[PDB]
Amino acid sequence: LADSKAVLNQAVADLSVAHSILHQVHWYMRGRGFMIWHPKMDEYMEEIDGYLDEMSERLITLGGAPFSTLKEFSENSQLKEVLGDYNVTIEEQLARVVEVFRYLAALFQKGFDVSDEEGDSVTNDIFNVAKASIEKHIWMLQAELGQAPKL
Amino acid sequence: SLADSKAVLNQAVADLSVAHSILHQVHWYMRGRGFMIWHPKMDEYMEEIDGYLDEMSERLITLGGAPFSTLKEFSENSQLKEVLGDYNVTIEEQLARVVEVFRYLAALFQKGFDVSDEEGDSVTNDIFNVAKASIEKHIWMLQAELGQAPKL
Amino acid sequence: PSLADSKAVLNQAVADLSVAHSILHQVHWYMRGRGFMIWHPKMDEYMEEIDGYLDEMSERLITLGGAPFSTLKEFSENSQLKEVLGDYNVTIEEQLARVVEVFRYLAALFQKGFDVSDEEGDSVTNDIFNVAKASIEKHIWMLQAELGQAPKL
Amino acid sequence: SLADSKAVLNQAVADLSVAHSILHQVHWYMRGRGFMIWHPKMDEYMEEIDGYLDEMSERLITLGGAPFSTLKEFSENSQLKEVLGDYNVTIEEQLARVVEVFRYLAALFQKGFDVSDEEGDSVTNDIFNVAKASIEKHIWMLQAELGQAPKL
Amino acid sequence: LADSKAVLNQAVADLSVAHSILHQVHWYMRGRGFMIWHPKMDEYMEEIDGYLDEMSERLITLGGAPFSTLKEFSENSQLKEVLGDYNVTIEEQLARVVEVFRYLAALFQKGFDVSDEEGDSVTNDIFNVAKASIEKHIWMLQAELGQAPKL
Amino acid sequence: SLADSKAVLNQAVADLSVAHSILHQVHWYMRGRGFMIWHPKMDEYMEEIDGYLDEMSERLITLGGAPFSTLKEFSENSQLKEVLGDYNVTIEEQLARVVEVFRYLAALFQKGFDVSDEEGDSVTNDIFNVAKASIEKHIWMLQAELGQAPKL
Amino acid sequence: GSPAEIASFSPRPSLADSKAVLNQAVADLSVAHSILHQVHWYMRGRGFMIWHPKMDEYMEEIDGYLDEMSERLITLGGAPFSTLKEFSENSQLKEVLGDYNVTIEEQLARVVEVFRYLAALFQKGFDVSDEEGDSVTNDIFNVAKASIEKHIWMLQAELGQAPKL
Amino acid sequence: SLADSKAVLNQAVADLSVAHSILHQVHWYMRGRGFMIWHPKMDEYMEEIDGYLDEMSERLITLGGAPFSTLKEFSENSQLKEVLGDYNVTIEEQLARVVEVFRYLAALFQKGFDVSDEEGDSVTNDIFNVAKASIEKHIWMLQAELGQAPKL
Amino acid sequence: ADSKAVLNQAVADLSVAHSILHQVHWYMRGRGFMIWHPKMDEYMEEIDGYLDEMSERLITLGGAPFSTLKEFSENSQLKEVLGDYNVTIEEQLARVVEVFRYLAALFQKGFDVSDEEGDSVTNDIFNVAKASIEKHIWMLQAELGQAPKL
Amino acid sequence: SLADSKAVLNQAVADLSVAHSILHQVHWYMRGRGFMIWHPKMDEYMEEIDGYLDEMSERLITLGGAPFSTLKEFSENSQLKEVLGDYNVTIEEQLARVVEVFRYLAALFQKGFDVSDEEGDSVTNDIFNVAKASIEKHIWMLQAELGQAPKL
Amino acid sequence: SLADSKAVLNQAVADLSVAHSILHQVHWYMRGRGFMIWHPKMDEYMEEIDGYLDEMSERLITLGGAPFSTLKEFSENSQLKEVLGDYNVTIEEQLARVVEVFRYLAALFQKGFDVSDEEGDSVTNDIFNVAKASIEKHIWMLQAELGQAPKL
Amino acid sequence: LADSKAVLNQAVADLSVAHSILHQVHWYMRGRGFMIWHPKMDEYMEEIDGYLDEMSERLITLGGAPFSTLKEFSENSQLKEVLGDYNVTIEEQLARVVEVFRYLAALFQKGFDVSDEEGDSVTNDIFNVAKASIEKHIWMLQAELGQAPKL
Ligand SMILES: [Ca+2]
Ligand SMILES: [Ca+2]
Ligand SMILES: [Ca+2]
Ligand SMILES: [Ca+2]
Ligand SMILES: [Cl-]
Ligand SMILES: [Cl-]
Ligand SMILES: [Zn+2]
Ligand SMILES: [Zn+2]
Ligand SMILES: [Zn+2]
Ligand SMILES: [Zn+2]
Ligand SMILES: [Zn+2]
Ligand SMILES: [Zn+2]
Ligand SMILES: [Zn+2]
Ligand SMILES: [Zn+2]
Ligand SMILES: [Zn+2]
Ligand SMILES: [Zn+2]
Ligand SMILES: [Zn+2]
Ligand SMILES: [Zn+2]
Ligand SMILES: [Zn+2]
Ligand SMILES: [Zn+2]
Ligand SMILES: [Zn+2]
Ligand SMILES: [Zn+2]
Ligand SMILES: [Zn+2]
Ligand SMILES: [Zn+2]
Ligand SMILES: [Zn+2]
Ligand SMILES: [Zn+2]
Ligand SMILES: [Zn+2]
Ligand SMILES: [Zn+2]
Ligand SMILES: [Zn+2]
Ligand SMILES: [Zn+2]
Secondary structure, three states, rough: HHHHHHHHHHHHHHHHHHHHHHHHHHHHHHOOOHHHHHHHHHHHHHHHHHHHHHHHHHHOOOOOOOOOOHHHHHHHOOOOOOOOOOOOHHHHHHHHHHHHHHHHHHHHHHHEEEEEEOOOOOHHHHHHHHHHHHHHHHHHHHHHHHOOOOO | OHHHHHHHHHHHHHHHHHHHHHHHHHHHHOOOOHHHHHHHHHHHHHHHHHHHHHHHHHHHHHOOOOOOOHHHHHHHHHOOOOOOOOOOHHHHHHHHHHHHHHHHHHHHHHHHHHHHHHHHOOHHHHHHHHHHHHHHHHHHHHHHHHHOOOOO | OOOHHHHHHHHHHHHEEEEEEEEHHHHHOOOOOHHHHHHHHHHHHHHHHHHHHHHHHHHHEEEEEEOOOOOOOHHHHHOOOOOOOOOOOHHHHHHHHHHHHHHHHHHHHHHHHHHHHHHHHHHHHHHHHHHHHHHHHHHHOOOOOOOOOOOOO | OHHHHHHHHHHHHHHHHHHHHHHHHHHHHOOOOOOHHHHHHHHHHHHHHHHHHHHHHHHHOOOOOOOOOOOOHHHOOOOOOOOOOOOOOOHHHHHHHHHHHHHHHHHHHHHHHHHHHEEEEEHHHHHHHHHHHHHHHHHHHHHHHOOOOOOO | OHHHHHHHHHHHHHHHHHHHHHHHHHOOOOOOOOHHHHHHHHHHHHHHHHHHHHHHHHHHHOOOOOOOOOHHHHHHOOOOOOOOOOOOOOHHHHHHHHHHHHHHHHHHHHHHHHHHHOHHHHHHHHHHHHHHHHHHHHHHHHHOOOOOOOO | OOOOHHHHHHHHHHHHHHHHHHHHHHHHHOOOOHHHHHHHHHHHHHHHHHHHHHHHHHHHHHHHOOOOOHHHHHHHHOOOOOOOOOOOHHHHHHHHHHHHHHHHHHHHHHHHHHHHHHHHHHHHHHHHHHHHHHHHHHHHHHHHOOOOOOOO | OOOOOOOOOOOOOOOOOHHHHHHHHHHHHHHHHHHHHHHHHHHOOOOOHHHHHHHHHHHHHHHHHHHHHHHHHHHHHHOOOOHHHHHHHHOOOOOOOOOOOHHHHHHHHHHHHHHHHHHHHHHHHHHHHHHHHOHHHHHHHHHHHHHHHHHHHHHHHHHOOOOOO | OOOOHHHHHHHHHHHHHHHHHHHHHHHHHHOOOOHHHHHHHHHHHHHHHHHHHHHHHHHHHHHOOOOOHHHHHHHOOOOOOHHHHHOOOOOOHHHHHHHHHHHHHHHHHHHHHHHHHHHOOOOHHHHHHHHHHHHHHHHHHHHHHHHOOOOO | OOOHHHHHHHHHHHHHHHHHHHOOOOOOOOOOHHHHHHHHHHHHHHHHHHHHHHHHHHHHHHOOOOHHHHHHHOOOOOOOOOOOOOOHHHHHHHHHHHHHHHHHHHHHHHHHHHOOOOOOHHHHHHHHHHHHHHHHHHHHHHHHOOOOOO | HHHHHHHHHHHHHHHHHHHHHHHHHHHHHHHOOOOHHHHHHHHHHHHHHHHHHHHHOOOOOHHHOOOOOOHHHHHOOOOOOOOOOOOOHHHHHHHHHHHHHHHHHHHHHHHHHHHHHHOHHHHHHHHHHHHHHHHHHHHHHHHOOOOOOOOO | OOOHHHHHHHHHHHHHHHHHHHHHHHHHHHHOOHHHHHHHHHHHHHHHHHHHHHHHHHHHHHOOOOOOHHHHHHHHHHOOOOOOOOOOOOHHHHHHHHHHHHHHHHHHHHHHHHHHHHOOHHHHEEEEEEEHHHHHHHHHHHHHHHHHOOOO | OOHHHHHHHHHHHHHHHHHHHHHHHHHHOOOOOOOHHHHHHHHHHHHHHHHHHHHHHHHHHOOOOOOOHHHHHHHHHHOOOOOOOOOOOOHHHHHHHHHHHHHHHHHHHHHHHHHHHHOHHHHHHHHHHHHHHHHHHHHHHHHHHHOOOHH
């Protein structure tokens, strides 16, 4: 199950980075819509952390060894972090979250595919449930930004 | 016989069923700034609409009537017109649609209040009164969001 | 697109779930006979569940870039379920049979939903149909048991 | 000035006390299919009845009155008749008895509604209206179990 | 009171009248302490109603036929009711509740003895549980009244 | 028009604000046996009063009115008079003051009820009726604590 | 040499002491649970929607007694039966294969039969515990006997009968 | 001794009373996009303000003081100025006015902290500190909504 | 041969697994009792959860679940032994892991059989149960200082 | 008449007071593997003990007695002995100390049961029985954690 | 380094233990009007005292100290004096006794605050400030019940 | 670190790294006591995350710009991470936790002093509350390890 394991570990790195980005958005947001979106980041972070612990623990259960240091997360993740900046608009912050979410849904499709190929049906459901929710969020986020989900 | 109390309860069943459909369409097709507050707010409105619908229908049953209970009956008896879902409608326009729907229901509930008062059906009268109070409060709030007075 | 039929079955479900709700509510209202006190509130539970599937399936369709049916005309014209005027003289067991018939239809609709979404690689939609089908079938067993019959799925 | 309102509230106190007693008798003496549903349903009914009793008695106190407050006063002033407990009454018959008590109560509440309106006691008028709404809903549901229209 | 069923029915009657007396106190009470003791009667009434239902249903379980009319309760009960009087003092009202509770405690002891003698151990426990609570209440009401429980 | 309803709603906003102030003084300056029960009771009464205040004000807004919304407006339009806090007042005197305030409120709510009934503003009418009912129940209880009949 | 190993029919099943009745109850409660669960699954007919969930409530109550009586045996120094083999062999209740074609009336009459048996067993446990002076175990049997008897009344009432204890 | 800790506590009582009044005005008179989020948000702030008011007042009582307890006393002693309510004002102006009242309270709570530190009144010191911490958090968030730095 | 057969097998095996977990709950002695005694309650509630769900899926599918102790004991692959207080905590946990290993294996078989037969509902039931039991093996093994070794 | 029952109730008050003290010592002085489970567990034990203490003392009051109510009285009448706290005692020694306390309490509650039974004090009898049941369950569990039989 | 902060924490342990014992005596021996409010109120006070007790003792453990943990140590180190329970004491004298205990604890907590402030133990300092704040508020309330100023 | 803003940001870095370390322990833990200490790491992480958010938001409130990327956390933190190892014993993992907590308490002491020096009472209290809780944990962890707190 080398590929299932590998994608689970890739997920651990990327979710760790995704959390960090969402927290930056939580903190640096400024503009109309702050009062609704600030707490919404909290909800997203909670959901992301849930996936991260569950995917990492599935890897452990499969006899893997999850990335568990900031260096490992940073060097393995495909997500790039930029310095926090208050001058970003609310709408650009939300577009950043959509971008991160689009990537996560892409990674979870990969994890679904790989685990399906290897017969790891339990890991397959983990990725399917995560992808379901993340795609729902992409619809809602895109809707707030006056756009179709464009999955 | 409470003929008109019964007639107006059934009108309300039809119109509430269509009102719910319109709110659920707004819920789904909404796009633009404010989606995150207004999307779940439609859920709140739909629950309330739904509560009135079941109470009014069951008051009509209680009074010996026969509530409308098919979509055909709802469509053909409602005064509310439905249009196809369109994502290009703005938030402010979507909210305006909801206000128009609520103004109608508020007027309908007024008519039900008046009719039940005259027939001496005080229980029905109270059902309409409570529904109207809440709906008019929603109108104030929606209109305030839209930068406007309630204009009741 | 590659999900054209996934979308088609999601929309079908929206229309049929809307009509199925209408029917359950009719049963809630027009019910008369021994067992009213149990089954009357049970219809509320079914409607609640049905409404949950309705919102979720329509919203998945939106998420896939579709346009859900959202008028009573569209529900009525697209649904394969047929409505009749409410009648207090239908027996409790006839009303329960009617609900069973509706649930059999939805289980089959969800089966096709599963198969179509499965073939298009839309696994999220696949799971939505799968969860709904499971509960609907459990309901069929219970309703049939009340009626003194096997599930006969 | 509020002598009639006061008298009808005290009538309600007596009648509700006796209605409570009849419902508790049904609760205990019930036998036949449906017991498991209707036994606890009688507790729901008794709680509701007890709520009206305390509200109506305390409204009378509030208006400067003196509520009946002994079993003899309840029994002698109530229009409802009690009968000895009997396990051989059928479920259908027991539910029919509750319907009878509830119809009487719905009619008492209409009277109380009427009298309180005539004397300009709008608080008492509301108390009777709310209670009537709920009792009448119960008659619908009970009659339905019995395969009948509410026949209000 | 020949047996356990006889005492159970006696308690059904007395608990019904006890309830009525407590309800009278709830309504007719005036004086300093009203705000505490008004709601407290509700608590006592709920407890009394609990024993009432438990004891009656025990009698049914044993093959009896509980009293179930106001006439039966009033005639079989050893408690006496008087017309409501607002001019009774709050301390007199509490003293009246104590009187009722002392009677009930004594009835429950008689129920305990009879059921013990007959070997009706379920009924025995019912009376013992009820006696315990009533006696604790007598202590507390007596204390409010500046008196020893005097059981 | 609905001018008198709008006027009595606004009077209530002023008078509720001053009543709140008076109850908070009582909560704070209270001394004597009974403090431990009446001190928190004042919180409860304040929560109820603030509930009516917000509801009546927002009803006024909904009707196209403009509620009083400054302490100057409350003080100047209210019929209730305030005095400096004084720890030397007895519990009896504090509770009697609450009763007087409550009596005033019950009377204003009866005026609101009459005016709204005249103008056909049924929603406003019920708001006043609900409030009057609760306030009158409180006057019974306070008066009972003080060893007296409600004497409404 | 070594000590000879006894070969005997290890008969027991003489409800002599509290420990013995506690273990018997352990056995009977396990089988009662099994019967209740069969009624739960195989039930058909008008009343299913009320009685299907009700069996769950009864099962939970029975398991509560099972655990508490078993743990009381442990506390007193005993060794509770803890195998389906031990339960089936020591229990005086009889199990039959599941059958969908039993009326609700027949189902509830079966439950009554098991409950009557349990109440009688708990009465035995009560009497034994009392002669021994085991007042804690005595209480356990009394509490369980009380509620089982209440259920008998109710089930019998659904069936249009007196409790007939 | 406690002389100016008592003084600043009473100042806070007046200012919090007025701040409460302003927040309630904003709640009622707000119109424009953001209404549906900011309207209930004002209730949150009012509950919080009210908490400080009661705690600070009761600390003053505890210290042997006599808190201000009439609208006249609040109005005359508060440094905050009230204006007549106006629906036309924009949401962003409304939020800016709240920020203005909060900045004042934070500066008042600092003076409270300062004077209670020197005088040795450690309990009053912590009350002001906790309140200041939360008001400063609100300034950040309100300013953030308004597209600005906190600028404390 | 089918989903119905694996479902019934699970009914039998879950019944016996419950009994084993209850024996551990009762006979457990040694350091850790205070945490592992109640944990067995958690495991039993979970097991009983699957038991009822799988049994009722069987009924829904037109089957007839095993419903006597004799049917459970005979059809089950798990072997019960007599309760003994002298087993250590670490040995009792080792026993639970073996039972859970067996269950995870059965659930894989159920997953496979239902996948072939195109019975996605039953497939999902087995997939959900397997996920949880495997997670428990990880934790139990970790308490026993070992890898999951699935 | 109930002198023995009163006597044992009061003995229990003293002993439960000292037992609480010993348990709290264990809570504070525990060091070693198992701390994180056993530390909060002593809180569970203390709350249970405190419950018996208050119930038995109040039963004594109810019966006309005068419960020990000072540390001097508790210490002088308790048969349980206290030693100075020592972090150097092992977890397993601490648990053994808890077991010995509970064995004593179990024995005392049996003496209570026996005395109250002889005297016909069934309420006091039931209090000791219920307490003994729970303590004995704890002895089993504590012994199981120490790898031993309950050995009552 | 922190020997004086440790000493005062440990003094608190003894004093809080004796304070608990006094409150429990009051809880049990109380007779007179007000019993039904004050009896349970003693439970709330005991719960609060026990909170400080465990918190202060555990802070002492955390700082490397060894808390008093025996009735002998509590008794011998506490500055509070206990007397035998007396039913013949009035409610008002019982409450006055509680006030004395509380004035003592508030002085103790003031010492604790000052000592810990001098030694730069900011955590222990906050523990004392919080405890003092609450005990002082209770002194106000108890004194108000007794018709007096707090007189801190 | 010269001012309150500087130490608040130091804490943001260090709390982020401390989270990572606790999460490492949660995952790699093996040995008797796992079942207690595994969920305990969750409680610690929840608490750590609380300080992280409060301290960062206080920095924003004061007009600062908190670190908000893994790069900033890892480079600015004085805590060091190692690769996850299943072979570390329970007691060694708990000792790792203790040492992280000891550092954190020392940082919050420094934050207390710096903010007290600058008259920033609000920040002072934040550090004070955090240190109180961390010190209590050190005592309990040390107790589990058979040792004195040794602050
Ligand atoms: Ca007409
Ligand atoms: Ca019919
Ligand atoms: Ca019959
Ligand atoms: Ca404008
Ligand atoms: Cl605007
Ligand atoms: Cl050691
Ligand atoms: Zn974060
Ligand atoms: Zn985890
Ligand atoms: Zn809808
Ligand atoms: Zn309905
Ligand atoms: Zn509907
Ligand atoms: Zn939705
Ligand atoms: Zn009754
Ligand atoms: Zn009442
Ligand atoms: Zn009553
Ligand atoms: Zn009952
Ligand atoms: Zn106020
Ligand atoms: Zn409002
Ligand atoms: Zn089962
Ligand atoms: Zn157990
Ligand atoms: Zn306000
Ligand atoms: Zn207050
Ligand atoms: Zn079991
Ligand atoms: Zn089931
Ligand atoms: Zn203690
Ligand atoms: Zn007590
Ligand atoms: Zn105590
Ligand atoms: Zn502690
Ligand atoms: Zn983490
Ligand atoms: Zn935050």
